[PDB]
Automatic annotation (TrEMBL), chain B:
Any Pfam family the entry gives: Glyco_hydro_1
Active site: E373
UniProt xrefs under PANTHER family: ARYL-PHOSPHO-BETA-D-GLUCOSIDASE BGLC (PTHR10353:SF136), GLYCOSYL HYDROLASE (PTHR10353)
Homology family: Belongs to the glycosyl hydrolase 1 family.
Coiled coil: none
Protein name (database record): 6-phospho-beta-glucosidase
Entry GO CC: cytosol
PROSITE patterns: GLYCOSYL_HYDROL_F1_1, GLYCOSYL_HYDROL_F1_2
Enzyme class name: hydrolase
Amino acid sequence: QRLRPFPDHFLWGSASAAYQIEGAWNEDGKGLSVWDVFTKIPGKTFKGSNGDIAVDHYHRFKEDVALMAEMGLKAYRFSVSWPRIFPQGRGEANESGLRFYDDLINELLAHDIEPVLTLYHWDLPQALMDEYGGFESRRIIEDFNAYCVTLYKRYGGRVKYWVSLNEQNYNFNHGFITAMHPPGVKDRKRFYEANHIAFLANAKAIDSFRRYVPDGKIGPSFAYSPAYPLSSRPDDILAFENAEEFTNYWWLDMYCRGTYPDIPLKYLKEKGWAPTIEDGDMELLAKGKPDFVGVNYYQTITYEMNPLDGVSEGKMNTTGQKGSNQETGMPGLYKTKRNPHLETSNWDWAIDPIGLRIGLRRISSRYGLPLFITENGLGEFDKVENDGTIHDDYRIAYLRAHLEQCRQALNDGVDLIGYCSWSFTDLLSWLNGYQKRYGFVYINRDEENVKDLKRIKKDSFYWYQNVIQTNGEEL
Amino acid sequence: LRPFPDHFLWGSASAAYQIEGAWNEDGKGLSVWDVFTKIPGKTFKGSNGDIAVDHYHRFKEDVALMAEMGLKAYRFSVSWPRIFPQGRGEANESGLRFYDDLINELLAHDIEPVLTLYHWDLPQALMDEYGGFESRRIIEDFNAYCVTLYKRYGGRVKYWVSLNEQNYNFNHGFITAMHPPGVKDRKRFYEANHIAFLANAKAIDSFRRYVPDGKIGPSFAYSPAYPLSSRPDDILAFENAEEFTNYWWLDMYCRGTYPDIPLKYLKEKGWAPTIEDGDMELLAKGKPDFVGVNYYQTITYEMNPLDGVSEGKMNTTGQKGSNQETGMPGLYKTKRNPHLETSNWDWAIDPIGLRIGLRRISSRYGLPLFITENGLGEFDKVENDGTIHDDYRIAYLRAHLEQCRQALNDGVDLIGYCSWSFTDLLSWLNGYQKRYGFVYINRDEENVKDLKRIKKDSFYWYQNVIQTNGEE
């Protein structure tokens, strides 16, 4: 009946990011990233966890790729560490760093795994922060572009799928609104101005990609939480409308149309928070149209009316204590509300597989572009059993349900080209430590003890192995 | 909040068959509604538009009341069978002179005319000949009728509406059988809509040649969709409802393309329209200057099983609580919004929904917006002092105009606001007892009485709104 098969060459994938897996933070000439620094600030990370060693993927990448081949992955998404390539962020390139990702790519291609290369996954070189304030300076447009072009030249003959900026919205919100990411700022004006420069750097890098990799495909990976209204009360609908415009269309309109949504822009102008548009900005932004929209999906968010004296800031759950997450909002615009109809994880992330289908349809309907799920997964506590296995049936249940809704979205007509789970191995959660695990492959370490870093295939590894073998026929 | 724009079009609206009368005079051909209203059971208590309110003969009196109100704009409809009695033959000059004298009357009082090309009164001859909008021949005949109007009045009329409520009219025409041609067939519904889209685009393409300084757009019967709850199944129902009830028409009007999700579904069902060669190229030529918005209510939707609700009875009697739920099995069903009040005809009162709907169209399509209809239809009585205290109507219009100011402050490009309606008139299916007018008309379903014109309390309230440019 409705169990229609997935497309024959659907990109069954999994994903990682450099800072979360690589370790070797100060080896072979690598320069400091802003996270090499930020994780050393007391209280910024869970129980002092950092990526100095992470899961040692830089030295152990062949073991991990062999696990990907055992899995049968059709695609593997990874990011390149900018300060591993340019230790000072610009100027002289680090051949050891270029050689590492060159070897990684050849190892992947040997197993018929498509590389999906993320250009920017939050690890700005500290030298560029020191020099001119990172994304708060328009100088970053030229420096980010020069970095991207270096990779386009060396890897573009072999790598077809590229991601430009990863979760600009989420990363910059924590960087400039909540101060939970570098640079640790709480200022709405700076937030929108830094986002504006990041949009410019995205569009410049994509324009360059059209010339250096004309047969390639590129897009941003957006941190996507479709908005729900709490009720059919018109005030709650209007809160949902505002949330959709401010939290989703602000980035998605700019990425896909090259323009800002008018309703948020006019509101920001009155509050003094709008980005400054300089001469030539709109002409550059018009050149950044992507081949696909990368979707990082974990949960929907439900919204309700928020008075002018209402909620703004709230404390995030970074401990795994269920129900401790606090609501947030923009006074006069909207506030979050726990969805009463949804189960949540121990980190209070809502489990909403139908929301994935809803979100895929919304982007498909509004912008008419192909979609690529570049992240989807469940972060949970894992235990190793007496027989050495990890019975992560909760993770299988989550991934199964979301893959079922991917099938239905494909039935609905969305052009979904692939699906990358987060994450392939266990890795460092930026703010939640190593105990919030997402991997198919368990890594034996804790927050401050690396132990032996042993790789152990979880039960979800074998489930997804079978999903790929059957092209999604079985779950 | 920002004041209303300097040249904001404060207007009121009507439609030809609902006000004109004179159904068999000066050589006027038979409309599809002239025949349909004679069928027993199709109209409330047998009401018809043979006389209506006799605006044909009493147009100078009606226009005199618009000048007293200080209307900046007046939206009226031209009867196609009055211009072309057979639809496609020679034109009737008496009909062209009538609307000539009507427009001239409006400009003599500094009222901007807004001309609606088609307002559901298809000439019966075209139904007899090739079946109206079920034949691609209507594309040429409708264009020929539009072009004739472009030449005569194009110098005096700058604001035009192409097709009025294609979705609402065609749904009752081919799904519920409550409008002509009394059909209940999904395939015919989408085929007829598809030809209407082609006629719309052809007429707009011709408009750019003959009226290069004018502005034109369709008037869409717009009910923004709500989900009943934050249950994902109910959000999905709302998503389906928006695509099928709204994007199907709005994507076509503004983008020239059907939304992919409804199209794939309709293809699998065998209900999709056949897209012939030349269709997409023509449809790309019909981009409007503005989207005309007919707003009365929002609709709230919930999950609907495959064996679930389909057809439902409509409230045409004014007995509150008699409207039944409808839907599309497996996609969505309507559910009365527990947070909204309703009229005696079960139409939901949702002024904030107008702001929400204006923002949605503005966000998705980026086009100027023109509210071409908005009003409350309710029972009216005449007091002993000869007045009509329709404070319920004032309350409705006040709330919606407050939300129009908020939408303008938000950034929506709202160019005007036409109330429905200026004088009392025949509701197609609800008779004369469902009154929307600023001006009361003394008549009922079976008795013409004297068709006296009596100004309601809402008449003076709107008079003050225009004088103060919406400040009060």
